[PDB]
């Protein structure tokens, strides 16, 4: 499975975050309850889609960059990427003020 | 038990307004798109918009914008399209289609229709 | 936008012969190795039914009679051995933008 990094990350308000992962690209909420917020490659028939998540690709490697602009303090919370064609381990954001 | 189930029919007066519903049931309501597709009496298919359930964001077909609200309910496991300012070109059989959330796998499940009828 | 444009309106073979259905797209409906296109199977009377998405791959139930095929914008839907079942109309989907358009359809009739 891909590595999803790093296992934790912590930014301030308004200041891009990203991780390191068809990808997509969850935030976990109760009782398994999963939204998928980006995916490589876009979806575009996706009903309300937030702009601010992107899943560019590297070059290769099979590296993935999972950026939220201008992040919200709501934003903070449990995200996860799994591969279609196997979840990746859970890695975290906070947001600060 | 994958599989959509829609309401009754419908015959409505111009400038009237009509609430179509679509209750899935048996599968996890959450991790499929909604997608509401229509077709004029012997003709082709016609995209009226989308909505993810989860959240409640919505995709839109230009030509109903402001003239169509979809609405979901999580506790009924039910979609509805609300078609305000009924014309007569809107006379036509309503679809529900479902779609994997995960990626865009086609509409692999459809209900049995509602036909809405306009005319004075 | 994009419109499909299937090619052509109707055709019509005894169950036996080879069916090929065509989509024809107006602009670009792959990206990244993907094909956002689709196809439905109508009957009279009753809801659309999918048989092939994403270009090639086949839905789960259909029967491995129906083929999709085709790339980058040029798609082709392919019956092998048809039965009495498969004379209705085939519709192609896009999904690669918004809004979502079909094609006007392809009618296989019974030529007699």
């Known amino acids: 499975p891909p590595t999803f990094s790093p296992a934790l990350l912590v930014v301030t308000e308004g200041d891009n975050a990203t991780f390191t992962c068809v990808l997509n690209w969850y935030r976990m909420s109760p009782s398994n309850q999963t939204d998928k917020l980006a995916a490589f490659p876009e979806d575009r028939s996706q009903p309300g889609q937030d702009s601010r998540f992107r899943v560019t690709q590297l070059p290769n490697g099979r590296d993935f960059h999972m950026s939220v602009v201008r992040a919200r303090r709501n934003d903070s919370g449990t995200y996860l990427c799994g591969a279609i064609s196997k979840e990746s381990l859970r890695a975290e954001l906070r947001v600060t003020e | 038990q994958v599989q959509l189930v829609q309401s009754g029919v419908e015959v409505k007066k111009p400038g009237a307004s009509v609430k179509v519903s679509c209750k899935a049931s048996?599968?996890?309501?959450?991790?499929?798109?909604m997608y509401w597709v229509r077709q004029a009496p012997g003709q082709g298919l016609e995209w009226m918009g989308g909505?993810?359930?989860?959240?409640?964001?919505?995709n839109f077909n230009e030509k109903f914008k402001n003239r169509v609200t979809l609405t979901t309910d999580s506790s009924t496991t039910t979609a509805y399209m609300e078609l305000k300012s009924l014309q007569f070109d809107d006379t036509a059989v309503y679809y529900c289609?479902?779609?994997?959330?995960?990626?865009?796998?086609?509409?692999?499940?459809w209900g049995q229709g509602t036909t809405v009828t306009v005319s004075s | 936008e994009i419109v499909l444009t299937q090619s052509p309106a109707t055709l019509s073979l005894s169950p036996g012969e080879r069916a090929t259905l065509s989509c024809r797209a107006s602009?670009?409906?792959?990206?990244?190795?993907?094909?956002?296109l689709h196809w439905y199977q109508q009957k009279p009377g009753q809801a659309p039914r999918l048989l092939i998405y994403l270009a090639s791959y086949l839905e789960s139930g259909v029967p491995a009679r129906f083929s999709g095929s085709g790339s980058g914008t040029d798609f082709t839907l392919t019956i092998s051995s048809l039965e009495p079942e498969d004379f209705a109309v085939y519709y192609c989907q896009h999904s690669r933008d918004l809004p979502l358009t079909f094609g006007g359809g392809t009618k296989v009739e019974i030529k007699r």
């Open positions: 048996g599968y996890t309501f959450t991790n499929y798109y």
């Open positions: 289609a479902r779609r994997d959330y995960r990626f865009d796998m086609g509409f692999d499940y």
């Open positions: 602009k670009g409906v792959s990206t990244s190795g993907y094909s956002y």
């Open positions: 909505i993810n359930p989860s959240n409640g964001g919505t």
